[PDB]
Amino acid sequence: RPAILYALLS
Amino acid sequence: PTLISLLEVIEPEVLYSGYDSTTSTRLMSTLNRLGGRQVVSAVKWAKALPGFRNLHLDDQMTLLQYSWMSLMAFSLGWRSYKQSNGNMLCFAPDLVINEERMQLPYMYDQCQQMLKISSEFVRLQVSYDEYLCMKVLLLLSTVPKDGLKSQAVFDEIRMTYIKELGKAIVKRNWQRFYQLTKLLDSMHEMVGGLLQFCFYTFVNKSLSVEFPEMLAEIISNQLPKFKAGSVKPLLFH
Ligand SMILES: C[C@H](CCC(=O)NCCC[N+](C)(C)CCCS(=O)(=O)[O-])[C@H]1CC[C@H]2[C@@H]3[C@H](O)C[C@@H]4C[C@H](O)CC[C@]4(C)[C@H]3C[C@H](O)[C@]12C
Ligand SMILES: C[C@@H]1C[C@H]2[C@@H]3CCC4=CC(=O)C=C[C@]4(C)[C@@]3(F)[C@@H](O)C[C@]2(C)[C@@]1(O)C(=O)CO
């Protein structure tokens, strides 16, 4: 599951 | 403070490719590089969507994961419309795709359909307020087949943004609304072509095409889910 995308919204 | 003007402020300004326009593979390997940053900016745009933050973490991961190509494609249509009246593909102000690099191998194919989106903008004379409003929808137009982990929240937000296209169209109601929802529908149809072409270049490693870690992760996740076919686009027809 996509790492950067995640740390964006989190 | 007006929603439509607020949209006007958050809409991303266009990135440069910063490209050395002096090969069919660099050309693609550039666009992906660029694309990755665009997606960054589109995420910051996403966070700064009113009501977007209302939606639950996962759903946001998802809506973006699903519509990302769509939004990218749409906006490329807008640029190519406003900049050359439908004539070239304008990715960034430095990277204009004319009929000469269209004859670049591999490449004719995918680029016709990027110009065909723009063609839609030409035929319909879309204004800016309209564009912004629709794009918000594309973000909410591609969803899993098996529900959404905040389905009530969504349905509200989606409606908000339609009523909003209502206002935007009124500014320029109800014979025109049809046409544009037909376009909002046919995006999933035409983007689904690019997404394929995308996955090809991705997994067929022997084409030495590069995608930045940003794009890399999103695609490698999004790929299997899309391949089986767990995705239903919300249509108007
Ligand atoms: C687009 C149509 C027709 C009504 C309308 O109003 N269309 C514009 C006419 C012209 N104007 C825009 C200038 C309005 C002038 C009045 S003014 O206020 O400007 O004086 C709209 C107006 C109200 C809409 C329903 C409700 O929303 C709620 C609900 C949402 C669900 O998802 C689907 C079902 C439902 C029942 C909707 C269906 C459809 O979607 C309707 C009939
Ligand atoms: C044909 C597909 C569709 C292409 C994309 C079309 C939409 C787009 C708009 C831009 O302004 C920047 C990059 C992207 C997001 C894109 F242009 C590139 O990234 C390359 C791309 C994915 C593609 O060329 C590839 O899969 C090659 O890897």
The DSSP code for B235 is: -
Best of B163, B173, B176 to mutate for ligand 1, by most ligand atoms within 8 A of CB? B173
The separation between the first and the last C-alpha atoms of chain B, rounded to the nearest angstrom, is 34
List the beta bridge partners of residue B143.
Answer: B232
Query: Which pairs count as long-range contacts for B124-129, CB under 8 Å and 24+ apart, including other chains?
Result: B124/B179, B124/B180, B124/B183, B126/B78, B126/B81, B126/B180, B127/B168, B127/B171, B127/B172, B128/B8, B129/B4, B129/B7, B129/B8, B129/B168, B129/B171, B129/B172
Distance, CA of B62 to CA of B64 (rounded, Å): 5
Chain A residues contacting B via beta carbons under 8 Å: 1-6, 8-10
**Element spanning B96, H or E:** strand B96-97
Amino acid present at B87:
N
Least Cα distance to B168 among B134, B137, B139 occurs for: B134
The separation between the first and the last C-alpha atoms of chain A, rounded to the nearest angstrom, is 14
Least Cα distance to B72 among B201, B181, B214, B182 occurs for: B214
Q: Are B192 and B229 in contact (CB under 8 A)?
A: no
- A6: nearest CA in chain B? B61
Is the minimum CB–CB distance between B230 and chain A shorter than 8 Å? no
Do you know the residue count of chain A? 10
**Ligand 2 pocket list (CB less than 6 A):** B 28, 31-32, 34-35, 38, 72-73, 76, 91, 110, 194, 197-198, 201, 209
Backbone CA torsion sign across B138, B91, B46, B230: positive
Contacts of B102 (CB under 8 A, 6+ apart): B108, B111
Q: Residue B20: left if φ>0, alpha if ψ -120 to 50, beta else—which one?
A: beta
Q: How far is CA B48 from CA B5, B11, B148, in A?
A: 13, 9, 21
Distance, CA of B64 to CA of B44 (rounded, Å): 11
Domains of chain B and CATH, by start: 3-233 (1.10.565.10)
Provide, as residue numbers in chain A, all residues whose Cβ is less than 8 Å from the Cβ of B221.
Answer: 1-2
For chain B, the C-alpha Rg in angstroms (whole number) is: 17
Q: Tokens 């599951």, residue? A: A1
* Helical axes B108-124 vs B57-84, angle rounded to 10°: 80
Distance, CA of B218 to CA of B66 (rounded, Å): 9
Q: Are B72 and B35 in contact (CB under 8 A)?
A: yes
**Ligand 1 pocket list (CB less than 6 A):** B 159, 166, 170, 173-174
Q: How far is CA B8 from CA B44, B59, B79, in A?
A: 14, 24, 15
The resolution in Å comes to 3.0
Structure tokens at B106: 């591999």
Technique employed here was: X-ray
Q: Are B48 and B139 in contact (CB under 8 A)?
A: no
